[PDB]
Symmetry: C7
Subunit: 236 residues, 7 copies
């Protein structure tokens, strides 16, 4: 006939908790202002993704309620200070370890969302109009979940990008020790022919690296779409 | 039953003031005419963004009013003068510090708008047609707010671009001191073989740098979309 | 109740004169035929923009009339002659100063149009169907004004482009003095081995520069869209 | 009241003759077959543009008639022979002067069409449904005229392109005199080591230049859109 | 009144024969298999274009009949054998002369179709609904004719492409005489150090040239659209 | 009157057999696994094309039946083993001859389909609604046939691509004989300085060639569209 | 008449089991974290594809049921530890053999799905509305199956990509043995001039290779579309 028990089991399965998203807060990789902006952009994007996940959770409760109603349809139930400032900022911070932890957490969440779309599979023994409509609704929830996983992945991708940017800038930029060297070796009045040249070259490379850093550390915000409305089935 | 108190609390939350946008006026980085044009373009774009923010504020008041009405639905409640002119203009101004302050303010505003979309989350305990319609309206307001944050970001991005352009032009262009040097060292009649060559090279590089400056300092205007109309719910 | 005085004040504000567009006529930067074509294209585009501005002015009068009617709804109220020709033309004219004056005027007009969209802001105290419709109409006028400002900007951009093209061609092309030199130094029969070589090189570079000049001096016409029709509100 | 005289004056203004298009027939720049094809393509495109201009003239008469009817609505009123052939063809013809005359004429026509859209401006003192409809019709005619001017411009652009192609090919291709030289200097049996090399190089460059010439001289046809139908207003 | 004679004259003009398309059959430029494929592709495309031209001819007869009916509405009326094979094929055939004759014929047809759209011009003295509809139908026929001319042009363009490909391959590929030379000079046992090197280089260049030849000689088919249906006007 | 005999003749012509597609099975050019995959992909694509050709044959029978009914409407009728493995596989197989036979067959089929669209030409003496509808149906069949010919061409193109890939890989990859040489010349303990270098270079080039081979030998599947449904005309 | 037996045979043919998809689980090619992520992404994508294949199987059962009903319609029926860590991870794992086994299995599945669309061919002897509708439904199932085969192919393609990435990284990155060498040869205090240079170069190349590895090992998820609903035919 009609297997109400299959429908009830599927209703409990569809609103079971999914994976818990990460909650760690990523810190700025360095002391540069663009780095702090990037870290704050990531934190805000993470908060917004968590918020929309709670919205999806509500949609799944409503879908489970509709399934239970559908089941009940059957039966009863030259000074160096600019260079020194740039270098000091660049070598401060944690150099990206918290970014990597952030990215790992969000990649894990990506994968664990992807593993959890079994709960939206089609029914074995249920058929008819209500079953078709509920399957369409579960399919929509599945699509939204996959989109959310993709957003989680893009979040982790941006965090990894920030970590690699920090490394690239750190090996492309004159060290604080090199700047202290160049300054002192400019305190002696025999090398000027060389030190002044080196100062100009450092100051060049520094402006160049920092311009690269400032533009590439401008992260896109992540806005999650709201989950599609669950199908509503009133109690009999 | 129906939690009117949740709706009233959400109505007060949705029309609470958001972050205040920055009001500082960015100055031209140099004395060049294109720089002044760019600064004025930025000032006008900032004014226009502030104006549309006031429009969005009105839409949020109307949305709060509609929520209060919906709640009441339940119960009672060769001369060097061209070179000298070019250099003098290029080294005048504040060299972009007010642009950087402008950009910082607008990036902060970007982030603080992004942090303030909690006020548009779905309802916990409210359901039905009015709740669905009000959620759709809040979702629209949220979308508009995110677009406005994106425009704020683009504003700050343009200001940062102007600051970097000023630096690039300043290290790519012969100094006023170098021009005074070249002129004087051309006042002595032994070096002509060299000074005339150097004059032509300077004048080349100067035209080149200034053409770059004039085209890249042509900033796009920013026109904000008007906020979507709030849903209207009449009093019972 | 309903503030008729706000509506009447807004009606007077919306049809107040806007900035006056520039009327100066840009001259050809040189004697080349493509330069004259470019100057005439600019003059025609400027005339067409001014014409459409008058159209927009009429639309704003009609909008003000509709607002006054809406207010009344409440209560009572080898020879060198080709080279010598090319050079002589290239060094004639004003070399682009009138183009720069033209561009400055049109950039100023761009900015002053952008500053004048306050007159289309939403109403504070007016609400209902007529207010919504009038706000939509003002929004349309605002959009058209911003498009017109963008066209003004593109006009100034083209004029600046012509000035820079004139400079580029002038420093890329052999001078009239250099051609007179090469000719005379070819009047003596000892240098032929050199002068004939130099003549061919000049004639090369000249064809090259003039082909560049002729294609890049082909300016797009500017056709302004007509302003959207104002909303019509009949007197009561 | 209603100014019939304004409408009648505008009716006479809208059907006044516009500029006369050029009628000169462009000749092939050289003797090459692709050049003759290009000249014939240009002649056909010019004929087709002139034909559609006559169509637009009829539409303007009909529009003027409709305006007069609308006014009456108010009151009473190794051998060298392949090289020698290629060179002989390339140096024949007029080398592009008639192309330049053609292009000048069509650029003048472009500009003079652009200057003649005043006749489609909105009305000062006429209003209502018929006025709106007639303004829409005049706007359509204006759009068609601007498109026709753009086509005229593209026609002149192609003619200029053909002239520049002729120059480019002429300075990129071995002269007839150089070929006669190479042949004769190959009649003496001491230089073969050199002349045979030079023959192969000429024959290379010649095939190369002629392939370039043949593909770039393949001109797009110009098909004018027919003018939009004038609005029809019957006599009262 | 109504000029029936104009309509009848236009009916005879519209169904007069147009230019006759060429009927010559293009031969393969060489003995290569890709060349034979290309020639057959061209022959088939030419046949298909001729077929659709006959279809258009029928549409013009029907249009003329409809015009006559509309008129009657008023009143009564290392071995070298792979190299030797490649070279022998490449130097066989007519080397592209029949391709050039084919292309000339089809370019002439292109132009003569373009010259023959006068027969679709608007009417001078005929007006009303039938005239508008017949003008729309003639306009459609004109559009189809222009598309057919464009297809004829593309046909000639492909034939010219094949001829140029044959030339390019012939001067890029080792001659049969050079291969006989290399073989014989490899029959003597003193040069091996050189001949074996040269054999490998030839065999390289030969594979390279033939791969180029085989891919570029893959011609697109030409499918003509069928002509739009003529408007049908029944006899009175 | 109405020529039924023309319709009956066209009905017999439209369902006459078309060309028979090739049935030969293409073998893998080498022993590489990607080559076997490519050959199997080609075999499957060929089978699928043959299947859809049978579908089109049924559609043509139905169209002929509809034509006969329409006619009846009138009257009565370092070890070297990875290198040795790679080389041994690369030099096995038939090196692409069966691919070339396959491609020839499918190109012939392409052309012979293109030659066989006469059977869908418009009618001479048949007119009216049924004739128009049957012509539209024949036009659709013609379009499908041209698409099928294009798919046949793409099939042959892929086979040719595989043959050229086999040649490219074979001359870009160290021979089995060269690998046996390098190994043995590494069996003697005097050359190591050289042989080890050569081994690394071979192993490099081999990985490089095989990666190229594996990615380019990944062939797209060919899915034919089903033929459009024939028009149905019931018997009178 | 109507061949019910053909329909019943086709119903049994359409729901016969298709090929069984592979079930092997691909392991990470190395010890890098991105490699583990890639392997897990592949495993999840494989699981999701298998799930949708089960969905398609249900659709084919329903289609077979509808066919049986349609049949019944007729009758009764400087330390080195970062380098040492990087190298140790890179050389761990199986270096991609399980990826290659995975890819082979999924390519086989691709091909075997492509070979199994005979079951959706059109009917020989069945005609009418039900036959047309069932053919459309089978065509849809065929389209879905081809899309699923394409997804299987993309799955195998990604696995092959991971294997090639592992090889590329392994020959682009300093060996663990080379790092042990460089460290020890830095334990002796005579070579520093060289070893320190080599350490910096290794550390460079290592960061470079690992950044490449981490970004290219970021695999797209594969989301299969759900199969189109089978046509429903109720029993008579």
């Amino acid at each position: 006939t009609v297997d109400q028990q299959e429908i009830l089991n599927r209703a409990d399965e569809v609103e079971a908790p999914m994976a818990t998203p990460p909650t760690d807060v990523p810190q700025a990789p360095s002391g540069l202002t663009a780095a702090n902006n990037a870290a704050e952009q990531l934190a805000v994007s993470a908060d917004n993704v968590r918020l929309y996940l709670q919205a999806g959770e509500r949609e799944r409760q409503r879908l489970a309620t509709s399934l239970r109603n559908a089941a009940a349809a059957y039966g009863e139930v030259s000074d160096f200070t600019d260079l020194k400032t740039a270098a000091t900022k660049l070598e401060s911070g944690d150099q990206g370890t918290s970014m990597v932890n952030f990215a790992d957490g969000w990649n894990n969440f990506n994968l664990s969302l992807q593993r959890d779309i079994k709960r939206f599979r089609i029914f074995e023994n249920w058929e008819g109009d209500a079953a078709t409509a509920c399957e369409a609704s579960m399919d929509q929830q599945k699509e939204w979940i996959l989109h959310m996983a993709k957003l989680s992945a893009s979040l982790a991708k941006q965090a990894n990008f920030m970590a690699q940017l920090q490394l690239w800038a750190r090996r492309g930029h004159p060290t604080l020790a090199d700047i202290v060297e160049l300054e002192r070796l400019a305190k002696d009045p025999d090398y000027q022919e060389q030190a002044i040249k080196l100062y100009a070259e450092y100051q060049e490379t520094s402006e160049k690296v920092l311009s690269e850093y400032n533009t590439k550390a401008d992260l896109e915000p992540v806005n999650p779409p709201k989950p599609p409305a669950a199908i509503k089935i009133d109690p009999p």
